[PDB]
């Protein structure tokens, strides 16, 4: 039969009725007098749902262009399909109906950056939520920017002092690298980042204006009460004048959580482009990858491993590559990134964890087994790498850091032999007790950053045996006794001269002999 | 009534499509079905784009024909809140299911609302003594915080939450709201009789002197109802916090059932599934619930949310997402419950933000950290005790083994509610006494 070829329809489109109704409703003779909705610069919402709106129209919209619904909520045009535009929603999608108008704004996504952003608890879109008014001394730059090239960078030289003894000796961090703090839940990651912020408050009042570090903390997917406690803490220490709090919490919409580290990186790149130094902590980057996974899976993109999209490596790559040490022709600024990736029961062979480990230079693996051994911070010293190495390590700390790494390397292999109490060797016992001295030396209470000169003196006093006479159980207070009972001149000249000179290593060699240790 | 009376278009299990001729309702609004056997409340979840909403039904859809007229209420699901709800059992749409007449309603609040903002948050850290030794020692509960009781399928998180109700909920002074999200109906009847016999629920005309409101959407209910009963318990608790302005308790049982009900619904909305089989919008739905359970400046909601883990798997995404929203976490393990220890709190995985040397004192903090250190050094030697035996260890290691075996038995405690089946009378321990004992 000749009718069978036209039996079943072969559609090249889905919203065919939406194209037919733009040509049949003018065929009514009474509806030719401007009875047509324009779709050149406007757009009608076809289907809302789950924080995803699909908009018919928007012919002149750009990919990644921030559009605005007529309800007031904004949105980012992400999928530019052949017959509609898949628009994510930056807020609650309860305010959107089918048939609402979408007014595009012509702007790729913008956040207020500048010197007036300091101390402002803002979202991943730019609105402050701390209740201190709008942003005043700011300017509106792009969210997604191109990373600096190969000309625009120089070598990572100057160190970024953390204040934590387990990381400033073993895993040193220079001003301009990307150092990952990877661990499990409740292992000390956010606390290490907060110590890295509070040490900048302790440091910035001793250095000039060109050497100050302005922190930016990006809380993605956390609670609102956690960011409230952190704002209370940074105000109680007074470090809010150096800190920007970008906060897209768990109540906030999924594209806000997706764009929070990008917004924070744009707010922290202002100090990098103006010769200052910046420090950004993309806290809970795995929750940002989860928010991007949800935003893509509702946008009908084909999923891959663990139902993530393909370009989720690119998602963290183009975010982390904006952290660099610029050359002197471009201002000499720096941005030191600190991603935080949570693993689940130690599976480091996951997808997002391997991607962020493959991107970043260093890694700080905090383990939940050594957290409950009393070793706080829970730094696994074997797996932690720092690929600047001794190029940006503090001099003086470099004189004892090789000894610390080698002695802890022997103490890591002396294990599985200490469970036989009569099996004395008198040489593996010496390194076995020396490793306990060095391990319990590197403990710190939280929210207590130690300056780098006192760290160098305190680890010098332990790698040279000046706390070797005490027991293994009293080194947490003998450390404080060694810090207090020495002359204040030793730290005062060690911070200034830059290294342990031969004109100092005979002074504090004897100043450790006039100390009182609580054990003999 | 041609406009604003839509008809049912299609039905896929608990997912009902209504097609309208004009004025589609807003998302998260409640619809009513005309001529159904029970009062079947739909709730719009999407807009399908052909003048068609995609509704979640709060009751069974058995017996829905694709011609049934559906009216719009023009509002979300609104429950009767106020002081008059004290002592009533409510389902997901605010009806009384305890057969004591209608609910004395001060106001009619919807269940969909925005979370309180950043500036309305309170930053307070005061302890909540519960009488259990492991909770008051190793992970002390914040008074006005969030508490998760992890562990699954017979570890005792429903016994522990009855012990927490029996301990804290009578010595509190403020109100209480129990929101049973998908637990057993028998357990709800047991709690109803046990709260009548204890005096925190009264019947008759003296109903207002009671101090506990029950909201039940228990595990017989379809997945439309279990996805919304936590929000109803939140609306009832948020009226007391936001308007009455006083501190409450909110014991939500099996908050995994909220995520599971939304996963049963989101299989049939045609969304692409995420990791192991859950919905893509897990974290945002759980955030939009769990950020409403917060202590503001005017009041406090002290929540103890039992979290069921699936097949004892903490790397499952439905509890691993929930781990970020909790202040004090109390992980229960079956490897300790098979050792006879009760309550089976895992001491080396259950944490809290209250365990800080500035808050609870350096004595309590150092005792808790020493207990965790002794148990962890015991846990490192477990294979050596397994294959090589106790007769080759060091002296200090076979002293820490004995100290750890003493504190593992010592962390166990007989409960005030568990004596119905165990015979041993329950012991409410004070805080300083168990600190001194450890």
């Amino acid at each position: 039969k000749a009718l069978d070829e036209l039996r079943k329809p072969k559609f090249s489109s889905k919203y065919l009725i939406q194209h037919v109704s733009q040509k049949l409703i003018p065929a009514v003779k009474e509806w030719e007098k401007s009875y047509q909705p324009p779709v050149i610069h406007l757009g009608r919402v076809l289907s809302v749902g789950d924080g995803i709106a699909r908009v018919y129209g928007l012919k002149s919209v750009q990919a990644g262009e921030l559009v605005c619904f007529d309800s007031g909520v904004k949105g980012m045009a992400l999928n530019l399909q052949a017959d509609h535009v898949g628009v994510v929603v930056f807020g609650n999608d309860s305010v959107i109906h089918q048939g609402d108008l979408v007014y595009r704004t012509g702007q790729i996504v913008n956040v207020p950056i500048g010197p007036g952003t300091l101390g402002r608890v803002t979202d991943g879109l730019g609105q402050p939520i701390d209740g201190k008014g709008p942003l005043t001394n700011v300017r509106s730059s792009l969210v997604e920017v191109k990373a600096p090239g190969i000309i625009a960078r120089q070598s990572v030289r100057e160190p970024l002092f953390t204040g934590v003894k387990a990381v400033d000796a073993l895993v040193p961090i220079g001003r301009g690298q990307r150092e990952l703090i990877i661990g499990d839940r409740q292992t000390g990651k956010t606390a290490v980042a907060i110590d890295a912020i509070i040490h900048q408050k302790n440091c910035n009042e001793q250095v000039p204006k060109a050497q100050r570090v302005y922190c930016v903390y990006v809380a993605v997917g956390q609670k609102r009460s956690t960011v409230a406690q952190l704002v209370k803490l940074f105000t109680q220490t007074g470090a809010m004048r150096y800190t920007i709090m970008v906060s897209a919490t768990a109540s906030d919409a999924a594209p806000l959580q997706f764009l929070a580290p990008y917004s924070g990186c744009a707010m922290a790149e202002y100090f990098r482009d103006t010769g200052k130094h910046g420090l950004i902590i993309y806290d809970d980057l795995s929750k940002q990858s989860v928010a991007y996974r949800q935003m893509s899976l509702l946008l009908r993109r084909p999923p891959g491993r663990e139902a993530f999209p393909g370009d989720v490596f690119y998602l963290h790559s183009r975010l982390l590559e904006r952290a660099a040490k610029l050359s002197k022709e471009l201002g000499g600024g720096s941005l030191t990134a600190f991603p935080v990736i949570e693993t689940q029961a130690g599976d480091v062979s996951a997808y997002i964890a391997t991607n962020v480990i493959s991107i970043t230079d260093g890694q700080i693996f905090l383990e939940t087994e050594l957290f409950y051994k009393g070793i706080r911070p829970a730094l696994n010293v074997g797996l932690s790498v720092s690929r600047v190495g001794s190029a940006a390590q503090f001099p003086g700390m470099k004189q004892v850091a090789g000894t610390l790494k080698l002695e802890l390397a022997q103490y890591r292999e002396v294990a599985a032999f200490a469970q036989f109490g009569s099996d004395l060797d008198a040489a593996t016992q010496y390194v076995l007790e020396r490793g306990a001295r060095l391990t319990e030396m590197l403990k710190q209470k939280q929210f207590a950053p130690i300056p780098i000169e006192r760290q160098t003196v305190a680890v010098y006093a332990a790698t040279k045996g000046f706390l070797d006479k005490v027991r293994v159980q009293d080194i947490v207070a003998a450390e404080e006794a060694v810090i207090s009972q020495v002359n204040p001149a030793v730290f005062k000249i060690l911070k200034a001269n830059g290294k342990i000179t031969p004109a100092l290593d005979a002074h504090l060699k004897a100043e450790l002999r006039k100390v009182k240790l609580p054990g003999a | 009534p041609a406009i604003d009376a839509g008809y049912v278009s299609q039905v896929i299990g608990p997912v009902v499509d209504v097609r309208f001729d004009g004025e589609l309702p807003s998302i998260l609004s409640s619809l009513e079905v005309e001529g159904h056997s029970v009062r079947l409340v739909l709730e719009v979840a999407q807009h399908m784009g052909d003048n068609t909403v995609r509704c979640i039904a709060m009751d069974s859809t058995d017996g829905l024909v694709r011609g049934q007229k559906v009216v719009d209420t023009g509002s979300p699901i609104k429950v009767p809140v106020g002081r008059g709800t004290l002592g009533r059992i409510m389902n997901v749409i605010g009806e009384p299911v305890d057969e004591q007449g209608p609910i004395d309603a001060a106001d009619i609040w919807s269940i969909h609302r925005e979370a309180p903002e950043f500036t309305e948050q309170s930053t307070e850290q005061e302890i909540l003594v519960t009488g259990i030794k492991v909770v008051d020692l190793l992970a002390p509960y914040q008074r006005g915080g969030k508490i998760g009781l992890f562990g699954g399928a017979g570890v005792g998180k429903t016994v522990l939450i009855m012990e927490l109700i029996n301990n804290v909920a009578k010595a509190h002074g403020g109100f209480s709201v129990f929101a049973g999200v998908g637990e057993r109906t028998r357990e709800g009847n047991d709690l109803y009789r046990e709260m009548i016999e204890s005096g925190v629920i009264k019947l008759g005309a003296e109903r207002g002197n009671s101090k506990c409101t029950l909201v039940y959407g228990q595990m017989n209910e379809p997945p439309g109802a279990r996805a919304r009963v936590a929000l109803t318990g939140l609306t009832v608790a948020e009226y007391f916090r936001d308007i009455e302005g006083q501190d409450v308790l909110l014991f939500v049982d099996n908050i995994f059932r909220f995520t599971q009900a939304n996963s049963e619904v989101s299989a049939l909305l045609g969304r692409i599934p995420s990791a192991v089989g859950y919905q893509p919008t897990l974290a945002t739905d759980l955030g939009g619930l769990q950020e409403r359970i917060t202590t503001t400046t005017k009041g406090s909601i002290t929540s103890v949310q039992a979290v069921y883990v699936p097949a004892d798997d903490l790397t499952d995404p439905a509890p691993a997402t929930t781990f970020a929203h909790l202040d004090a976490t109390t992980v229960l393990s079956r490897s300790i419950a098979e050792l006879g220890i009760y309550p089976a709190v895992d001491p080396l995985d259950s944490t809290s933000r209250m365990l800080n040397p500035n808050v609870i004192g350096a004595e309590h903090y150092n005792v808790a950290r020493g207990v965790q250190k002794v148990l962890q050094d015991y846990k490192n030697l477990q294979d050596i005790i397994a294959i090589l035996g106790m007769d080759e260890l060091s002296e200090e290691d076979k002293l820490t083994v004995a100290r750890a075996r003493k504190i593992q038995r010592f962390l166990s405690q007989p409960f005030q509610v568990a004596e119905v089946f165990t015979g041993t009378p329950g012991k409410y321990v004070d805080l300083a006494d168990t600190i001194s004992g450890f």
């Binding site: 130690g346 599976d347 | 294959i387």
Partner: peptide
């Protein structure tokens, strides 16, 4: 964690 159980199997078999 499906490499750690294989390494634990190999250590237990060597023991």
């Amino acid at each position: 964690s499906n490499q750690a159980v294989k390494q634990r199997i190999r250590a237990i078999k060597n023991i």
